[PDB]
Amino acid sequence: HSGIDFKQLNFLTKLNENHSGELWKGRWQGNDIVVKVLKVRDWSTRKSRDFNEECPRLRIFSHPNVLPVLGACQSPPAPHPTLITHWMPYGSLYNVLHEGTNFVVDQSQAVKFALDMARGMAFLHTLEPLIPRHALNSRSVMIDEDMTARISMADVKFSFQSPGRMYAPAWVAPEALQKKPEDTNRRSADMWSFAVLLWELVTREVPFADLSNMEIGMKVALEGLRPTIPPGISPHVSKLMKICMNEDPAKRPKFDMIVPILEKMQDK
Amino acid sequence: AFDTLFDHAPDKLNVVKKTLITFVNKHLNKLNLEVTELETQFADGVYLVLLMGLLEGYFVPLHSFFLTPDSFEQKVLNVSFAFELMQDGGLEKPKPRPEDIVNCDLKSTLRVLYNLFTKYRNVE
C-alpha cells in the first residue's frame, strides 16, 4: 500500500480553505473527486506514519450509505498529507438542508435521509474497533446524485488534525463534550448525534444557530442546553426523537433497532 | 514597541487596558463570565483557552484542559495549551514563557491580550 500518487491528481477548482487545510474538485483515474489537503503544524515522521495507518480504515467499499475515502497520498513524497473521495453533486446534507437555493427536500426525502444515515451508522458500528474520531453531523454526511445519503469517511478527523478543537459541538452528546472517548460509550454518543439530525430534518434549522461553537459546548455540557422539541409533529416522530436523545446514554437505542422503525416510516 | 507603551506611556497604557477589558468581556460575557482584573484573571490559563475558542470559532472539550486547575503545573499546562491554540490560529509563538502568565507578570499578560485584541478586532 504505497497510497495514491499525488502526481496523478488533476486539480480542477478550489472549493474551500479552512482550519483543516483545503478542498479541491478534481479528477483521478477516471473518477470525479474532491482532494482534501491537510495542513498540519509541526508535521513529523510520527504523524506521517499515523496518517498512513489511519487512512486505510476509511476505505470502506461495502455499504451504499458509506462514502469511502478512495485513497490517500503519503507525505512524503506528497507535498502534504492528502486524501481523496468521490465528488457528491449535492454536497453535504448540511448544504442540501440549509443552503439549498434551488429546491427544498420534502419530508418523505427527509425520512429517507434519516433511514440512509441510520443504515450507514449501524454498519460502521459493526466495525471492530470503531473508526476513531468519527463524529456524525450534517456536515459529515454527503448526498449523492440519486439523493442517497452517505456517511463521509473523508470527514473523520485524524489523530494529528485539530485535536482539542470541536467545530460542530451542537450534534455531540453531553457526555462527549466532557469525557475522553475512552470513557464514553461511543455508540450511544453517536445516537445522540442522530437525534439532533432528526431535530434538524424536522425543523430545517441549524441546531443552536444563534450561538458560537464555544457557547454551544459550554451550555450543553455545563448548563443543560438542549434542542427544543418542535411543536405539533407526529407523536411517533416525537417519541423517536426523545428516545434517541435520552439523557441516559445506556437507554438510547442502537442504530440497528431504529432502522426498522424508519423503514415503516417511508411507507409502513 | 509594546515595551515603550508599557514602560513609558501610562496615559496610553490605561486606554489600552480599559479596552482589553471591553474586548475580553465582549467574548467571555457570552459564557456569563466577567473580567474585572487583568493582572490576575488570566493567570490560571482557563480564560485564555475559552477566549481562543470564542475568537477562533470552536469549543474545547473539557477533557482537553483543566477547567478548574488544582496546581501551578496544571495552570502552566493550560497556558501552554492556549499558546498552542494561538499558533494554530497563525500567531507566532508568544514571547512570554507560560510561567510568566501564571506568575501574574502584567507586561507578559497585557502583551498576549494586546496581540489577541489586534488580530481579532472585528470578530463579534
Ligand SMILES: Nc1ncnc2c1ncn2[C@@H]1O[C@H](COP(=O)(O)OP(=O)(O)OP(=O)(O)O)[C@@H](O)[C@H]1O
Ligand atoms: N465529496 C464531496 N463532494 C462534493 N462536495 C464536497 C465533498 N466533500 C466536501 N464537499 C464540499 O466542500 C465544502 C467544504 O468541505 P471541507 O471539508 O473543506 O469543510 P468542512 O467539511 O466544513 O470541515 P472539515 O475540514 O473539518 O472536513 C463542504 O461544505 C461541501 O460543500
Ligand SMILES: [Mg+2]
Ligand atoms: Mg469536510
